[PDB]
Structure 1
Amino acid sequence: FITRSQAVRKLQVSLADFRRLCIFKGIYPFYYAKDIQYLMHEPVLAKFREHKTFARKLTRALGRGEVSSAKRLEEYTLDHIIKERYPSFPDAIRDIDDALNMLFLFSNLPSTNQVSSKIINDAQKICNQWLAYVAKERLVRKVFVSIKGVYYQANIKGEEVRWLVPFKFPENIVDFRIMLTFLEFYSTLLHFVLYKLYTDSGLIYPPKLDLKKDKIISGLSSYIVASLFSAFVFYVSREVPIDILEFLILSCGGNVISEAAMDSKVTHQIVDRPVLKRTYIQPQWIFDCINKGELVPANKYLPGEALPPHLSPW
């Protein structure tokens, strides 16, 4: 065993890059020598050294001038680490339950100096694929509406991922650098996981997507318990999030029409206002039905009535 400082000196790699290497691989107690020896043989060290040399050469060019050289100088993924930490696809799905919370949180974070707009765009786009896949296999089984958010539980081949959907409200902003590395690793994992899931679903990947619809709602309505709400069509009022209600109905096999679409079999209308003028129903009815497949009539969730005690479904 060697000290953390001793291991860093042996690797002669700054602590900033050692954090990334440990996060990708995982080393902890003071630390066993064998883990450090295995890490030293990883190819990621060569790539990190190449990146450092690229940065120093770019700085040299910028200081000397001739910006053309810096532009011309501009000419990786941790695939190997994925296999090591995830020997098999079921292991990756198991690790998803805690890994993907960071990605889903980042999907709604605002752009700032600490996070580039590209990272947020990629995180949001990853959701557009995750929800699209989940709305085709109809693996949604829980819809606990928690204060932290709607605690979704998609039965991803029997591991019941506990991913949480943060609310659409502004998430006002800790060392994001570690969070950035975790997000990068989770996105690299998500690329292959989504590829595998789409290949299993039988749909040609990558499939076509619609952008005009994206410019209207920007979400699941693009990029092309289960027995509930068959062929059901619900109207959403101006007091509910379409991003959540529409996904559940689409997974169930129904359809949703947005009130703000211009900002029939209409069996129900989701409304929360005390004043109303379709079967008017509170949003709690859909969640309660999905949580247990009750398919209870609307009589138990008329607007303005006392809400029932929604015990946590766990």
Structure 2
Amino acid sequence: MRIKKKNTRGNARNFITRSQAVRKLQVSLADFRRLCIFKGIYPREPRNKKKANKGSTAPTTFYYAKDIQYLMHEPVLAKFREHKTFARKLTRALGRGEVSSAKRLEENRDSYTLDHIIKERYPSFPDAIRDIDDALNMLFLFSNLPSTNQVSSKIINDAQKICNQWLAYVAKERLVRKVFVSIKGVYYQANIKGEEVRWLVPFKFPENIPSDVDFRIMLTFLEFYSTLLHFVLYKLYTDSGLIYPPKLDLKKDKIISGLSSYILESRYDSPVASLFSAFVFYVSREVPIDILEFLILSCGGNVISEAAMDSKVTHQIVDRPVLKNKVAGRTYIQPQWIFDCINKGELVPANKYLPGEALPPHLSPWEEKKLKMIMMSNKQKKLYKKMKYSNAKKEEQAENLKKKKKQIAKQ
């Protein structure tokens, strides 16, 4: 052989720069990143960064060559091109002054579907449920958003619809194990086909949207997770449960627009799923309902709200320092009791949960050696000193918790 050129072989055809990926695809950076979001493609780290370049030490991100080289032939890229053609051919109609032909161009418009993009991403159903962890976190955030000029109302209404479908199913087949109310929101854990998904729901207050965040990146994630959730929910309902999609009662959606609405027709294993059976809870006005009625209906209780007005009831959930009525028939609880009954599973006594007293701390469900240092190498001294510092920074923080507990317990 002739002397081969140096920096064109091993790591140079294994990886490519962002610029080289964009150029090779002949696609805009935005659309390159849109496809990258849909396909689940990410930058990868080579063992040599400069052999992955053509010699240069430079701030560079490396994609996998065969990954981009596999993205090139794909229906979604072709449909992006078709959207670009449609865009100019519409503004041709609009810019001239003809409205009827433009309106007709809307009628003769097909759009890209993210159907086949999931088959190649999550080939098995249990793999899709391993992703639904991050998928349900976007979607439940986007339900609790005011619609802006960035994000249309149709987007939020469809996202909220999927959210309500998810909440309805989990409360239907009784698949909750753990709850955790934090400052951030309310965490749930759910054995969905026996693999424990986790997801977060914010509190139902108006959310201050920063102008800092980019509502074009988040919209494509929503666009992928949305379709992914449609296919997941069809699979779940048509396997073990119900018809999809279920209908919604109009005068129920006028009252709550939550979870007691949206009725679903068809044609246990865990202690949590057997709890609250033959119990009827009267949720008061003061507590948030949609974060709580999900849990009651999931375990096996029943809900009658103060809100619905605007019997069999055995417990009332009230958050006031002064409670007015006080009947002999009901038992009076601050919601912390429910948030502990789900976590333990053993029905915690309501003696520490009376209206007017302070709640329990609410835990999450989640010499010679200095002399024998010497005979270690530098490649072992560096590592051992690092492990010593990592244990020290833990133990001193544990000492901080103990010292703070002692300083508070005195007061």
Do they superpose with TM above 0.5?
yes
The alpha carbon displacement at 1:99 in A equals 2.3
Q: SS where residue 188 of structure 2 aligns?
A: strand
Where does 1:91-110 land on structure 2 (aligned, <5 Å)? 91-110=127-146
The alpha carbon displacement at 1:108 in A equals 0.6
Distance (Å, rounded) in 1 between the aligned partners of 2:335 and 2:64? 54
Structure 2 alignment gaps of length 5 or more: 1-14, 44-62, 264-271, 324-329, 367-411
Note if contact 1:104-1:166 (Cα within 8 Å) is conserved in structure 2.
Answer: yes
Q: SS where residue 258 of structure 2 aligns?
A: coil
The alpha carbon displacement at 1:85 in A equals 1.2
Note if contact 1:140-1:155 (Cα within 8 Å) is conserved in structure 2.
Answer: yes
Distance (Å, rounded) in 2 between the aligned partners of 1:43 and 1:19? 16
Structure 1 alignment gaps of length 5 or more: none
Count of paired positions: 312
Note if contact 2:253-2:262 (Cα within 8 Å) is conserved in structure 1.
Answer: no
Q: Which of 161, 172, 175 is matched with 1:136 structurally? A: 172
Q: SS where residue 179 of structure 1 aligns?
A: helix
The alpha carbon displacement at 1:237 in A equals 1.8
Q: SS where residue 2 of structure 1 aligns?
A: strand
Range moving further from structure 2, 100-109 or 86-95:
100-109
TM-score by length of 1: 0.96
The alpha carbon displacement at 1:209 in A equals 2.0
The alpha carbon displacement at 1:91 in A equals 0.1
Task: Output the aligned Cα RMSD.
Answer: 1.2
Note if contact 2:315-2:333 (Cα within 8 Å) is conserved in structure 1.
Answer: yes
The alpha carbon displacement at 1:32 in A equals 2.7
The alpha carbon displacement at 1:202 in A equals 3.1
Note if contact 2:281-2:313 (Cα within 8 Å) is conserved in structure 1.
Answer: yes
Note if contact 1:97-1:162 (Cα within 8 Å) is conserved in structure 2.
Answer: yes
1:229 matched to 2:276? The reply is yes
- CA-to-aligned-CA distance 1:52-107 (integer Å, 9 cap, x gap): 00001001111111111100011332111101110100000001112221111111
Q: SS where residue 158 of structure 1 aligns?
A: coil
The alpha carbon displacement at 1:203 in A equals 1.6
Distance (Å, rounded) in 1 between the aligned partners of 2:353 and 2:64? 59
Q: SS where residue 213 of structure 1 aligns?
A: helix
TM-score by length of 2: 0.74
User: In the alignment, what sits opposite 1:64?
Assistant: 96
Q: Which of 306, 310, 314 is matched with 1:259 structurally? A: 306
Distance (Å, rounded) in 2 between the aligned partners of 1:197 and 1:69? 43
Note if contact 1:58-1:70 (Cα within 8 Å) is conserved in structure 2.
Answer: yes
User: In the alignment, what sits opposite 1:189?
Assistant: 228
The alpha carbon displacement at 1:168 in A equals 0.4
The alpha carbon displacement at 1:299 in A equals 2.0
Q: Which of 18, 23, 37 is matched with 1:4 structurally? A: 18
The alpha carbon displacement at 1:252 in A equals 1.5
Note if contact 2:352-2:359 (Cα within 8 Å) is conserved in structure 1.
Answer: no
The alpha carbon displacement at 1:132 in A equals 0.5
- CA-to-aligned-CA distance 1:144-193 (integer Å, 9 cap, x gap): 11111111111112221110111101111111111000000000100000
Distance 1:89-1:43 versus aligned 2 partners, 3 A rule: same
Note if contact 2:143-2:156 (Cα within 8 Å) is conserved in structure 1.
Answer: yes
The alpha carbon displacement at 1:16 in A equals 1.3
User: In the alignment, what sits opposite 1:284?
Assistant: 336
Question: Which of 1 and 2 has greater Rg?
Answer: 2
The alpha carbon displacement at 1:201 in A equals 2.7
The alpha carbon displacement at 1:129 in A equals 0.3
Distance (Å, rounded) in 2 between the aligned partners of 1:214 and 1:245? 18
The alpha carbon displacement at 1:279 in A equals 0.8
User: In the alignment, what sits opposite 2:72?
Assistant: 40
Q: SS where residue 162 of structure 1 aligns?
A: strand
Note if contact 1:288-1:294 (Cα within 8 Å) is conserved in structure 2.
Answer: no
Q: SS where residue 151 of structure 2 aligns?
A: coil
Note if contact 1:111-1:117 (Cα within 8 Å) is conserved in structure 2.
Answer: yes
The alpha carbon displacement at 1:297 in A equals 3.2
The alpha carbon displacement at 1:7 in A equals 1.7
Identity %: 100
- CA-to-aligned-CA distance 1:92-129 (integer Å, 9 cap, x gap): 00011122211111111110011011110111111110
Higher relative contact order (CA 8 A, sep 6+): 1
Note if contact 2:173-2:241 (Cα within 8 Å) is conserved in structure 1.
Answer: no
- CA-to-aligned-CA distance 1:193-251 (integer Å, 9 cap, x gap): 01011112332222332121111111111222111111211111221011122111111
